[PDB]
Design a protein around this ligand. Sequence first.
Ligand code: NA
Lengths: 291, 307
Amino acid sequence: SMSRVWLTGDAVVDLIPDGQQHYLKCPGGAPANVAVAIARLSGRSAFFGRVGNDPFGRFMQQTLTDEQVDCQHLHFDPVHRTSTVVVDLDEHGERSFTFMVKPSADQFLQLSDIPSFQKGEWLHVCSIALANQPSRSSTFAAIAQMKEVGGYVSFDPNLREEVWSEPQELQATVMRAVGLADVVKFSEEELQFLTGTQSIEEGLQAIADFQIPLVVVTLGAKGALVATPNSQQIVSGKAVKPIDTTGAGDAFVGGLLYRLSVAQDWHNQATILDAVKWANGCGALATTQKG
Amino acid sequence: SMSRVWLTGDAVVDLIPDGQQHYLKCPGGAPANVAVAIARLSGRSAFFGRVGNDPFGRFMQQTLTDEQVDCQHLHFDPVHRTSTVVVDLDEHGERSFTFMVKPSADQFLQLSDIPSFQKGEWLHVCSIALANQPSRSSTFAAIAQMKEVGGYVSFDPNLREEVWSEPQELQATVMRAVGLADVVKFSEEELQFLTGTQSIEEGLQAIADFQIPLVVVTLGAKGALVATPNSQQIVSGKAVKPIDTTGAGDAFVGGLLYRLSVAQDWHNQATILDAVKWANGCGALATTQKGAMTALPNQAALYAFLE
Ligand code: NA
């Protein structure tokens, strides 16, 4: 087997209005979305993290097992509760969502929740895991161990100021993670938010000292900006400019990580280009399903 | 014209399983259930308490106004969440409840939220309101104010240790409220836990020195045992089709308190016995639909079941 992508962070149950007096149970959370995306490509994906010993936590355990994601290292906190979102409708029927549990069980990820890592494996992290302690320090420890054993680390800062008890620590904590990552996925505005000169130019030029092996930037319909310290390149979805990646950022990551993980040499420029091709493929695939 | 019944505590949105992938968005919570049960019996009930500024709390304000409980003294906490309970099933082999929000907005009930009380009125309190500060002191303060003015206090130690940040404080805090109430509703296992006893007779002699005007111990399906300083009696009941026990006890309290609230003197023995009979009726009836409030009967429906 040997090839494997580890995923960690917030497993989330979304509650959607199924008309009136009814909510639909929908599994969510960016780490779980990417984890499922990889397993749907017949890839080997495993999830470690913390949910609550509650029905919603059990829903995610069942969902992930069904989707063939290994969740043997999924823990159930007897006290804290699984992250739960309720989306709400306007007078005009326009969506709005509310975090129901703060802070959720995922924020209490412990050092003993971290599984043994093997050489050549991948670890993917989102910013929510870096919001508060003990999850902040536990996640960084997971990163260090993955690298120490000869593994690789990807990072996608799906940043939301909400979950943070101390929003001021965000710019420094996330840019800290960017420094330790092998692959970093940036949204256009995300790259900007860390002081963008209105362009993705010097916003890019800034991170140069970090010497990140691979940086990928979504570009709505323009496709995907691919950045290596040597080169610079755009990999469009060669089809009359398709569409965006609304909610398909996770699917994008999944397709990217699945291909990079099974590569003999993911550092290869040719291998990277093919991986981005799949990533755009997954991203487009998700947004054609009315999503 | 008759006695107003004040209700306070946690207004809760219950998520009840409808199939494998759906949840029923149902209004619940002890004070809200009892307030609604009283109103549906053409009784006069009002609610004072605290919910989240979130829409789950707007949902409960709407449900109370429609039912039609007074909630002028309903407040919205601009920081904390409205209590959300997810009911599932519990192998070995019944139902199970789980509190998703800790602490919820009702735990932050303030002294300023307490309305003016009047002689003859009623106040019902669930033990969840004593769980944490400042709700604990606020609720204890409200209980006292009703007693001082010549009102009456009802109390239901609906035990849920989960919401207590200091679970060791539960027994002493609950038993304090027990000694302050006119009416107390016990489960057979509740009275046992709080008294450290095993038999119902022992649990009664234990609390016998509080001289509580009325103690009710639900005997599950045999009805309830009715305890007064002088006399003990059993009051029977009839069975139905249990398909959702959610809030059956809150329905019991609803029927009990309404029947007492309309009497010129509720201390009358026959009145008390008739009230429990009402309580058994409303309790069983609520277990015929999904949701705590959904099957709370009007007078016509309740008389039809008892007749
Ligand atoms: Na019910």
